[PDB]
Amino acid sequence: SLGLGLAAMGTARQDVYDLLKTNLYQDDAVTGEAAGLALGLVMLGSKNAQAIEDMVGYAQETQHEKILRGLAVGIALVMYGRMEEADALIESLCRDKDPILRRSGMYTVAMAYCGSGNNKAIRRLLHVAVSDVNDDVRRAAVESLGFILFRTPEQCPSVVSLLSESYNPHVRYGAAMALGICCAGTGNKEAINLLEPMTNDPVNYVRQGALIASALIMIQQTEITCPKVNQFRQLYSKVINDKHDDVMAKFGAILAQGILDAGGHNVTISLQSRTGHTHMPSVVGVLVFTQFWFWFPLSHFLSLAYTPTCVIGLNKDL
Amino acid sequence: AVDTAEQVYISSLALLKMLKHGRAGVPMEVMGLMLGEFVDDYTVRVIDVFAMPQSGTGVSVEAVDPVFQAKMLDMLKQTGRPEMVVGWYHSHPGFGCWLSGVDINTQQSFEALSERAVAVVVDPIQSVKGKVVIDAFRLINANMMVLGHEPRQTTSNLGHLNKPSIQALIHGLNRHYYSITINYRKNELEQKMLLNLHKKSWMEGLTLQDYSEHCKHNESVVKEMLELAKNYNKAVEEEDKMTPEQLAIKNVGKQDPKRHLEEHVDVLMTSNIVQCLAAMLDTVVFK
Amino acid sequence: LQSVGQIVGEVLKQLTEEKFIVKATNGPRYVVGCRRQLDKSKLKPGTRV
Amino acid sequence: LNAKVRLLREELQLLQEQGSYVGEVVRAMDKKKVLVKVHPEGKFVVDVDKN
Amino acid sequence: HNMSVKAMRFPPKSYNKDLESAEERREREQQDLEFAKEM
Amino acid sequence: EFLHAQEEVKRIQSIPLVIGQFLEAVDQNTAIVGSTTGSNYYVRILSTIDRELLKPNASVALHKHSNALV
Amino acid sequence: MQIFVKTLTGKTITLEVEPSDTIENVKAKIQDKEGIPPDQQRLIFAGKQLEDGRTLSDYNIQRESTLHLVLRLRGG
Amino acid sequence: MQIFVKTLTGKTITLEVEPSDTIENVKAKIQDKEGIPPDQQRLIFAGKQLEDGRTLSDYNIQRESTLHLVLRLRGG
Amino acid sequence: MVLESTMVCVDNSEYMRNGDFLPTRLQAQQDAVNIVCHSKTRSNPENNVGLITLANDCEVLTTLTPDTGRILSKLHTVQPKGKITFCTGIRVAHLALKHRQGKNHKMRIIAFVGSPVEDNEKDLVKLAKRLKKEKVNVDIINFGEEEVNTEKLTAFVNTLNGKDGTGSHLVTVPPGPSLADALISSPILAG
Amino acid sequence: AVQKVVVHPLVLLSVVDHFNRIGKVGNQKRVVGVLLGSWQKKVLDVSNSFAVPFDEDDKDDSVWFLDHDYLENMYGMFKKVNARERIVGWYHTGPKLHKNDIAINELMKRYCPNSVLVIIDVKPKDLGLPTEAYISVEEVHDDGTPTSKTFEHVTSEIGAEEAEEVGVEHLLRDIKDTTVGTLSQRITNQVHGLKGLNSKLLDIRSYLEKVATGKLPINHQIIYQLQDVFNLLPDVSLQEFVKAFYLKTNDQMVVVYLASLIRSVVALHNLINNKIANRDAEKKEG
Amino acid sequence: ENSEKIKVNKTLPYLVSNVIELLDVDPNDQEEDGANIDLDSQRKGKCAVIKTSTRQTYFLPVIGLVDAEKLKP
């Protein structure tokens, strides 16, 4: 279901919709979430009303949480970019009492308004982070900001740098990740100088988050292009050797080692394209990557954001 | 193989039952049995719990006779609740949470009868107004470390969100058994009816507080306001004649007029406002 | 073989309903509670427990 | 307000750690070592923190 | 009272000093805890 | 949230705790106490207690493990 | 011949037996099937807790009847 | 009136019932024609699980309605 | 092998004070209960019986149990007064036969009528067809100052089990004062 | 006889569970069970319960089935694990008391002659408490019978024990009023009182219309007490009352005056301290 | 078998101590089963008080492997 959903994404081919429907209805805790994800992939951006009404039904009433924890992505992914047209869905999801659907609403409002800082989107998304009772949705809320801000990196430090001091660690991890994902392509001189104390926070997994964000923001910088590359190099090199530092921290260091030298240095992220348009496959890849918190083998989806960094000449079609 | 994501769901009713039973046997280690269902290989629900009769050794307890539970496990099915048993619990008062060297033995046979079994432990005297100290454990076979493997092959972050206490880790813990995360199953209806706790009769809201004692209370409070006001200006004059570093010490032995004054203003205003509003509402709503 | 002994001490006073201040036979003093079943009317100061 | 709340939350974990004795110093020795006396015990030869 | 309280918070500024207990003491505490738990 | 965290710190005041005598205060939130075991300690104090009741020779309670004023 | 037993997990077990089989022989067969120490397991039928020396015959048991098995339980 | 029971095996069995019938009796018919004992099932109806003390009318089920059925293995 | 559960219904109306039979009527019906309960016990030991009684209003003296001693001692306590209320008796028996421990047991009513009753045909047929849907089996003993010519009871067995189904049977009064329990000894088995 | 009853919350959660648990089994409108508790002086304290199988058919008011020996031996089982509790009553969850209920009581009275009936409403829509308590009495009247048998009202309240209160307080994470104090002293009170009184008067009118017509089985005692109620209302307009009311409020205001003055001067001192603590420190950065 | 079990409790190092007392106490008025301790009540024999060489005093609700009939202060 993973392979087929990826390879046929966005086609809205009917046969795969059929087969994934019948695979979900089994109500099994290891099939139904993968079917949900694959369905989201193939149904990409269709805003298909009957399919949505179909797939919300099972999610309204099931015993197994895994399926909900999968479909929470799919019901956002089907809804890409329609902006206010999706509002009717939003006004339902944020009304739900089940925490997983409230969590999904965040991803949905994020994916509906990508690249545009619509005032009501930022207002509601920021509001819910301050006031919800469940920490996972409080994370996902601030996590969503990066998608709706990324066209104006100079803005985010004006807001995330306050919330980075939240007492509870979930909000700190969320804000650090939102910053790291939003500006990720540019070695911004300001944002980086927030992350050093985060790299020394007593909570281990927020340090993991901070290391990931740091290694992401810098992907092709050099010591002349920003004055910090060697610092983070040697930080990774020490913490990966240290025999006493925590697991679920140095895991982040290993991933940093990989990402910073990914693809022979010949690659970078492209969530903004040089034509001025947004580039869906990198958006999907990075969103699915952020879910590694729940299920490790999704990390491969990060590869969908890599793009070559070259110029090539041609004289004839051959 | 086992994993690092398994999740235990407990209802409110099991919680209140366990707290009450554990607190009643406060000097000793009481016992009980818990029942529910394995909805899947990743999650387990416990729905209800019932106590058990014991003869107590000084250190611990043993279940006196099994005829009791053999009766109970069919006595109640005449009224629904057909669930099978899934685990047991005992309470450590103030010690902390761990499995003793014999609790482990008792868990051995529970697991041998069903490999998914669980053990639960609670602390009824350290738990206060929140943060009720509950934990869940399961044994691990030393065979796996003889191979040099480790249990609980891992695929997810969500198991590592908490750290064990030093006291729990001095005892066996990871070298003998491993913990499982817990969460609370709820529904809106029971919440909607539980919050009625300390609601009160409507009539209580419309009482006039015995107009003869009210003035006595008022012009009792005013007297100590007098005697404090005459002691305030000394501490105002001494504001700066000494090193401020020791000024904290100037508080410690001797009550200060400023902080101790304003609580009387709080009392007086809070009383005299509502006493006056209620009289107006009465003098309008009746005739 | 499973029995366990108990310390002997002397009651000094009662603080609240379930907290009492007691003295051991060697010097130390403690604040501690009691079983719910004992007749707390008997525990006048100076009794041995 | 956030800083004071965080400090209050951390106070519980901070307060759990162990205490410290009080002693009377007799006279100092070479290389940052002194001699101290604790009243219900014998005298010790101890070293000095960097501050 | 409201008039006085309104202008009280203007002078408090430049309070960026925000430290809890330490930076490197956590490693020492963890090492001591591990050493105590070993024995 | 601060009200909950304010009343969450009373786990420390559990049932078995020793009794000592207050001697003096070196500064804020730190003091010298003498346990009835027979030795003197230099220890920490808890924040929420009232600082106007620490008289020269009053009687206080200490944590059984940490020997911290409670 | 053959006999059944059930237990509080909902598990059932089936034993080839003969009426001459002693209760201790039954316990032995149970351990041979599942490994439980014979002293932690206890048996009940007809409201009566079993003892070792009697036999299926003198227990008046008949084909395919179902015993109850229950476990010893202590803290410590 | 007719309803269909799609088993996990893919086999769909024709069940004749009425709105006055009860889920316990549909389970009875299921045990009758497929042998499976009445506690070994869960009835899913592409939604919430069915409950046995309820009539077919309580679920607004109508002629030719279709349902899927899953086993309920317990223990091991 | 069939597993059985039976509610036995007993009359103690005023007319039960009659003693036209050789012993007091109470003794005859008591020994009838004895024989039927023993027969059901030996039929299968896991079978169980419960005791219910008719008067001006019905009463239950034991819930369904495999024991006999309680039934015997309670019936020893019984004393006859008041009218009879057959319809209510059958309906409450229908309630008590549900809420059953052995759901898979088949259900049996045994009934004695020692007195006349002003029952209504239409109500009894409604009840009877209801119970036929319930697929309950009734057996009834007409005796003493009988139901005249079995007149309603016949239609009862007609409307209930007893037509298109041999689950339910009417035994006429053995008119001779000899012990009816000895005389019904075949009819309960040749039911 | 008995002056008030205090109910612990554990029975509330147990009943709420039982209702849905039976909802599985059948189309039963109502459920019934046994209440266990203890006595002090004239006050009853009730703390634990278990359900008993029960059946009823709306065919008529006189065909219902309660099982004896289930209760008989279940109480034995509970006795054998806690000796302090005695059977002390029974409960059911009907929205209002039913016609059968008195004849139900005459059954179980054999187990305790003081037995009391508690109603627990399982579906709240309203701001009254969910409980009610009723005790049986005979009452004499001129004619129609020497005595009727009648349920009459005993006052009831919810309480909590030391540790069950901790348990419940752990669960109510999701809502609290912002601050206890004068805003709680009002909004948690006066508005609720006024709403309750309005609902009571509404029910009075609803009965009075169905006595002006409808079935109208006129009962004179109602009219007697209503005459008392209407006679009781005071004349506020009397001059000698007005002079007293002014002479009281015109005194009460002085204390608010004085207190507000003190509050203002303290806040002023606090401002002075802040400003001088700033101007003498800001200069240090040059 | 049980005999050798006793043999292993004895082992060897033993504190020495003096018997201070010999005492005789009777059960509570109510002694439910449930949670109840089979030691602080419901032994018909004596109970003792001892003084260790380390100057501690302990109550003993049961004496152990020695018959009280031959102990004296």
Side-chain angles (χ1 to χ4, degrees), chain G residues 10-25:
Chain G
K11 182 62 58 62
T12 74
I13 293 294
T14 65
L15 303 311
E16 181 74 31
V17 282
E18 299 299 336
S20 55
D21 289 346
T22 54
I23 301 305
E24 56 80 20
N25 180 260

Side-chain angles (χ1 to χ4, degrees), chain I residues 26 44 117:
Chain I
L26 293 178
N44 172 263
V117 61

Side-chain angles (χ1 to χ4, degrees), chain B residues 28 30 52-58, chain K residues 32-40:
Chain B
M28 69 186 291
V30 302
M52 191 70 70
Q54 291 68 233
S55 292
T57 311
Chain K
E32 71 182 354
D33 48 340
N36 196 358
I37 312 170
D38 193 38
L39 296 172
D40 301 83

Side-chain angles (χ1 to χ4, degrees), chain K:
Chain K
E1 176 180 71
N2 105 324
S3 76
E4 62 85 9
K5 196 68 61 174
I6 289 174
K7 189 171 305 191
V8 84
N9 194 45
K10 299 179 66 176
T11 188
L12 229 306
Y14 307 137
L15 207 67
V16 332
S17 65
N18 293 276
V19 182
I20 270 186
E21 253 277 26
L22 248 171
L23 188 58
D24 198 341
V25 69
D26 286 310
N28 193 59
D29 63 349
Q30 307 297 333
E31 290 289 1
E32 71 182 354
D33 48 340
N36 196 358
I37 312 170
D38 193 38
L39 296 172
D40 301 83
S41 289
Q42 300 292 355
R43 291 293 181 269
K44 194 59 57 173
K46 303 293 188 179
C47 297
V49 176
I50 74 159
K51 182 83 170 289
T52 65
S53 297
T54 56
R55 311 180 187 87
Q56 297 305 135
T57 50
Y58 296 125
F59 181 98
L60 293 180
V62 58
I63 280 78
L65 305 183
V66 176
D67 50 318
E69 284 68 28
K70 63 168 59 77
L71 292 174
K72 206 255 192 179

